[PDB]
Design a protein around this ligand. Structure first.
Ligand code: C5P
Ligand code: CL
Ligand code: MG
Length: 321
């Protein structure tokens, strides 16, 4: 009893526990809704930058309590956010991975270490191979790219579109017009190539609007609105253009050349071609090291079969079946 406490985490939105019934399992603490004061609390938590989340941040500030930034894990589910609960959860008491304006737990892991062991790196190799072999991604919904869709050996590049309102854009040091710059930069650099734009799945299903999807591009540009498996789609390109999408890291995991126009969580470590700078990120990292911290250590996994705390391999085995 000396090594544990009964001090719960405060939240200011009932929507968190609604969308994540196993929230307390992820947090390893109890949750309480709208506490009137800090006494008895071990932290406050919020989801993204919605109104209620910013109120939680303010209370953390007021009360001098840690603020836990909660997000869906990098491996989330078989289905989009509105289809099922998340299979892993990111819980960041420092900042949040997509916010390049401050440190985050993930950035701290990458900068200063404390975790690189032969045993962990072996696990990372195993998990990375399984994800590549089984074409696993965040949502695991898309269909395969049929043979004949792409012309063999034809030069082509891929631009990744995102959802309007994505906080990772502006907190990744970019803005709405960065997507237009990314497009014309790709044109100028690849005069002989075909240009493909992949619309975000949430925009395909009509729940959100996109940046590039709303633009009027040259008729020769091929805008993809079919719901292809993203890692299957990526296999048909060598060079990827992205502002701040997680799909850029999925491309990096497949060894593609990733040109970043924002500063996402995986940029600034020496593995990407960066149009932005982040002086706070100093240590160079290999892909395996970046993957180990970002996918194995940083998220909190549940064993989908038991509802109890687990690891990345529990979710992988669940996604395969
Ligand atoms: N244009 C896009 C952007 C993202 N995605 C998928 O959605 C996930 C989340 O991407 P965002 O970071 O852009 O929301 C990606 O890791 C990828 O699996 C996609 O399939 N097509
Ligand atoms: Cl919230
Ligand atoms: Mg998203």
């Amino acid at each position: 009893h000396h090594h544990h406490h009964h001090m719960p985490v405060g939240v200011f939105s009932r929507q968190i526990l609604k969308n994540v019934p196993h929230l307390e399992v992820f947090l390893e603490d109890s949750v309480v809704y709208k506490p009137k004061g800090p006494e008895g609390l071990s932290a406050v938590a919020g989801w993204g930058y919605k109104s209620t989340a910013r109120k939680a941040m303010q209370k953390a500030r007021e009360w001098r309590l840690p603020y836990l930034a909660l997000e869906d894990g990098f491996l989330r589910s078989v289905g989009l956010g509105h289809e099922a609960p998340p299979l892993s959860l990111i819980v960041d008491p420092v900042g949040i991975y997509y916010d390049a304006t401050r440190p985050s737990l993930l950035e701290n892991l990458l900068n200063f270490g404390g975790w690189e062991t032969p045993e962990l790196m072996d696990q990372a190799e195993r998990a990375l191979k399984l994800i590549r072999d089984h074409k696993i991604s965040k949502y695991n919904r898309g269909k395969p790219v049929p043979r004949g869709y792409f012309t063999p050996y034809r030069e082509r590049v891929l631009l990744i579109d995102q959802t309007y309102g994505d906080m990772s854009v502006r907190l990744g040091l970019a803005d709405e017009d960065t997507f237009r710059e990314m497009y014309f930069a790709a044109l100028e650099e690849n005069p002989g190539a075909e240009i493909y734009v992949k619309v975000h799945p949430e925009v395909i299903v009509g729940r959100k609007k996109g940046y590039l999807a709303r633009m009027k591009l040259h008729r020769s540009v091929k805008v993809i609105r079919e719901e292809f498996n993203p890692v299957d789609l990526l296999s048909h390109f060598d060079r990827i253009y992205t502002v701040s999408s997680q799909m850029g890291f999925e491309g990096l995991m497949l060894g593609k050349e990733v040109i970043c126009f924002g500063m996402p969580f995986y940029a600034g470590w020496g593995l990407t071609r960066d149009g932005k700078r982040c002086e706070r990120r100093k240590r160079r990292r290999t892909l395996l090291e970046l993957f180990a911290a970002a996918y194995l250590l940083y998220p909190r996994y549940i064993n989908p079969a038991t509802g109890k705390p687990g690891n990345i391999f529990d979710v992988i085995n669940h996604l395969i079946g």
